[PDB]
Design a protein around this ligand. Structure first.
Ligand code: FAD
Ligand code: FAD
Ligand code: NAP
Ligand code: NAP
Lengths: 452, 447
């Protein structure tokens, strides 16, 4: 019961971490501020809360999750496993290294359920506007409760933005899109790969989305796949029915034309072109503007807003590390809010951020990048009671996974790694990835193999 | 004039509001400063077509619900402008059901001739509108996506023209998370070619279902099924189209109906309507209603009763469209300019109740068109807007309704007489079923 009141925006993994950071301080006998957390969806989990919905949701709010059917962990589970809450504790047994979305979801929910932080969240409530008043030094937050269809506002001493940056699509235009007769969609709207069975699918872009959405279409029966790249080819060894081309230049009624002078009939086009940082509830004095990168400017320690240090952002960096980074950020943000870590002058903040940015521009290899984020996280955890974990060993595990992708892009999900928390090696899954058609938690956790 | 006005939206309603003020000025009156905000890159609202779906290039919800191959759903004659005629714009008579691009050209010509483009800030999204009791002004906050800046400005009056067919009502059905085909709302429908040789389920029984179904048919869908929550559409469909009772659930590949039937379905299109959504407004300003001929809380259907300095255009269900917006917009300027003083709050409320009472009386389509006819007539008699022949327009609606009944696939092949020029519309060079090309250039030639 501290005099202050805190608003957390979002109950995805970052917002969960911020609640769980406060709860942990309290469990250790400290006095915490009042917490309110606003979430526009009906349940928590952010990206992990899968929906069939597309575009706008039931209340007219933009659909948040970019996740599709059949999604599994893109990296080794070992690399995101929680320091305070372990896979063996949650599941009671060892499982393979690349669990499907439902299975990861269950695990991340288990940690917040055990913490009892659900009671701070208002669900089905969308944040409309946030304003800072110079007179009272307080934030006014306006939200819409879709359960009662009411709009109200409330006053807060600090605000922590945890609204994510993989939800609002970057969707470039190509010549002839208004004439093309097949479906055009962004990766954000992709749901079931079965919709593209026996079709030719063009994937525009050359990053994680293209890799994975491609692979799903392949696995579930697409006739043929083409992917095209703006600047450099992905360079993996694709299956027989998948080619990689230079950029799309235009499209016609039925066909796509490429910079190499090739052309062919295409059934559907999927833009795998990324996301923008979008904060519609924030005016300029509070609003972060950046491209997706390891070190956004204007965030002291990557979390405190330099123009108004009572506002914080969690998770706004590109994510090589995910969950552990959110915890380190969230722990750091509580300690500054609670007064345990006093902020330096604005000048010092800006000099610190510039050094981080300078170093970021140096980075060339994937290895250097994991290390950089690793060092970032380490610098945060050393400032709080958050427990150190083995970053160098995690980095090494990332490297193995990168190498496995190089070897065979379709089979990397069949490998196993050793837990950094428990030293235990992950078992082989009961069905190989290519044949594991069912993505349900029940099928994963059983022990019946699936038929080819 | 000392005052400043914000018009939100540059579709047909916001174009009408601009064009209203310009007319007053053209006749020598001193008008207020106008600023109009439009989130899209060009005007025309629904009629500005986009391949885009869900969210646009700036992260704003995609506004237009219009699809390839869309044509006027009613006779052009029934929406022809009183002050700007078809013959004037096109130079010649043209058929009665023009494709989207052609109608769009027509409505743009009126505003281009008016020169009102200079009032509009394009690519600018409205984020928040607030009323300040102290200064008796509105603060409007917007995001200019060309410069990625957010700013605000003070206004004496605000006119909301943001439409009500853009935010989908999308109900959930059991099994949607397991169904392997595409599921979309009518709002996201674009090219019917996407469904060639496929079985498409259309949920709902109104205009969207009729027309989205018709396009799929016309462009080669293997089979169509449409299901209705309460009553069948009742038209005589082609051989490959059934009408069934409501969907109850769906599985991996199949849809199950309340009649106990079931079949394999490739794609599901929810034609289930829209909601009135105003994310930039708090409760003191925000209209809440279902789609209907007479929403409550709007005096004369346009003046917000809780704050009479705020107005809404086009929020009614639309039997009449463009003519109705003009009448509202003319009525709104005259009150803004002080030419029509407002009655007390009690009187406003008694007037709206009488309108609502009458609305609840209505049973037949004919009574409805007439009710909106009467509403419009009451509006135009208060201002210099030119009367036009409402009872003749009503009669024309009635012909069109009858033509739909006879044959749902061919109603677009008929012609009607202009209420402004008395001229009969010519038969189009190609019959609807065969008129695959929807371009303006193809429509205006004669092959
Ligand atoms: C397709 C895809 C696959 C991914 N796969 C992996 C993976 O395998 N492993 C991994 O570690 N990471 C993965 N990620 C990264 C993912 O970003 C993180 O795991 C995590 O979800 C980020 O958490 P967050 O809470 O910061 O953002 P989010 O999960 O996006 O949560 C943001 C929350 O804020 C809410 N919100 C937004 N605006 C408002 C508002 N106006 N009012 C109220 N609430 C609002 C949203 O509803 C949501 O709940 C993936 C991301 C994507 C997009
Ligand atoms: C699929 C479909 C077919 C139709 N067919 C016909 C027909 O055949 N004949 C007929 O008479 N009528 C038809 N209509 C009716 C249509 O509503 C009207 O013709 C007309 O478009 C309504 O005009 P409006 O200006 O009120 O709304 P809209 O055309 O919807 O214009 C709203 C405008 O406001 C803007 N806006 C919304 N929010 C913001 C914001 N926050 N900031 C800035 N700008 C914003 C939008 O970008 C848009 O330009 C059809 C409607 C639909 C959906
Ligand atoms: N687990 C991890 O280690 C890890 C690490 C980082 C990110 N991620 C994932 O990154 C994901 C987002 O993936 P993403 O692929 O959607 O975003 P992204 O990584 O930013 O990729 C954007 C992609 O679209 C391409 N592109 C943009 N504009 C284009 C155009 N006009 N024409 C052609 N191509 C264009 C870019 O090409 P260019 O390359 O030429 O710019 C790039 O390939 C999230 O799921 C997150 O999990 C995961
Ligand atoms: N030119 C004209 O004369 C005219 C006049 C009026 C409107 N319009 C048009 O109205 C159009 C809006 O089209 P619309 O069809 O989308 O809006 P709508 O007319 O409100 O259609 C809503 C439809 O969805 C159905 N529905 C809602 N929930 C359902 C559920 N759970 N299950 C099954 N069906 C459900 C309704 O069934 P129920 O009927 O049982 O409620 C109804 O058929 C605009 O295009 C506008 O032009 C045109």
């Amino acid at each position: 019961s501290m005099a202050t009141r805190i608003a957390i925006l979002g109950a995805g993994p970052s917002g969960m971490a911020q609640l769980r950071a406060f709860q942990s301080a309290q469990e250790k006998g400290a006095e915490i501020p009042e917490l309110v957390c606003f979430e526009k969806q009906a349940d928590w989990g952010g990206q992990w809360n899968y929906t069939w919905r597309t575009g706008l949701d039931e209340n007219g709010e933009p659909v948040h999750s970019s996740m599709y059917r059949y999604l599994w962990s893109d990296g080794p589970k070992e690399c995101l496993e929680f320091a305070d809450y372990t896979f063996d504790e949650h599941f009671g047994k060892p499982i393979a290294s690349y669990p499907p979305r439902e299975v990861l979801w269950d695990y991340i929910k288990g940690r917040v359920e055990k913490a009892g932080v659900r009671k701070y969240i208002r669900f089905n409530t969308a944040v409309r506007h946030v304003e800072f008043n110079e007179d009272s030094q307080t934030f006014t937050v306006t939200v819409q409760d879709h359960t009662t269809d009411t709009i109200y506002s409330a006053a807060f001493d600090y605000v922590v933005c945890c609204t994510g940056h993989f939800s609002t699509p970057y969707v470039p235009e190509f010549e002839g899109f208004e004439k093309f007769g097949g479906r055009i969609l962004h990766a954000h709207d992709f749901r079931d790969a079965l919709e593209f069975k026996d079709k030719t699918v063009l994937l525009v872009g050359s990053s994680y989305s293209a890799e994975d959405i491609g692979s799903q279409c392949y696995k579930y029966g697409a006739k043929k796949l083409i992917s095209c790249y703006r600047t450099a080819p992905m360079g993996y060894k694709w299956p027989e029915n998948w080619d990689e081309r230079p950029n799309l230049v235009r499209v016609d009624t039925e066909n796509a034309y490429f910079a190499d002078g090739s052309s062919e009939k295409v059934d559907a086009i999927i833009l795998c072109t990324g996301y923008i940082h979008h904060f519609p509830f924030l005016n300029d004095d509070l609003r972060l503007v950046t491209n997706n990168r390891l070190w956004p400017l204007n965030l002291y320690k990557g979390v405190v807003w330099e123009d108004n240090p009572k506002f914080f952002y969690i998770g706004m960096q590109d994510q090589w590390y995910s969950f552990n980074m959110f915890d380190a950020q969230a722990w750091y943000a509580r300690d500054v809010i609670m007064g345990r870590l006093p902020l330096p002058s604005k000048e010092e903040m800006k000099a610190d951020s510039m050094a981080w940015r300078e170093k970021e521009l140096t980075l060339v290899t994937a290895e250097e990048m994991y290390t950089y984020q690793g060092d970032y996280i380490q610098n945060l955890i050393d400032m709080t009671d958050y427990p150190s974990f083995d970053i160098p060993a995690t980095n090494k595990t990332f490297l193995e996974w990168k190498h496995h992708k190089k070897e065979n892009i379709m089979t990397f999900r069949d490998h196993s790694y050793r837990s950094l928390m428990t030293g235990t090696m992950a078992p082989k899954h009961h069905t190989p990835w290519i044949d594991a058609l069912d993505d349900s938690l029940e099928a994963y956790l059983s022990d019946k193999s699936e038929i080819p």
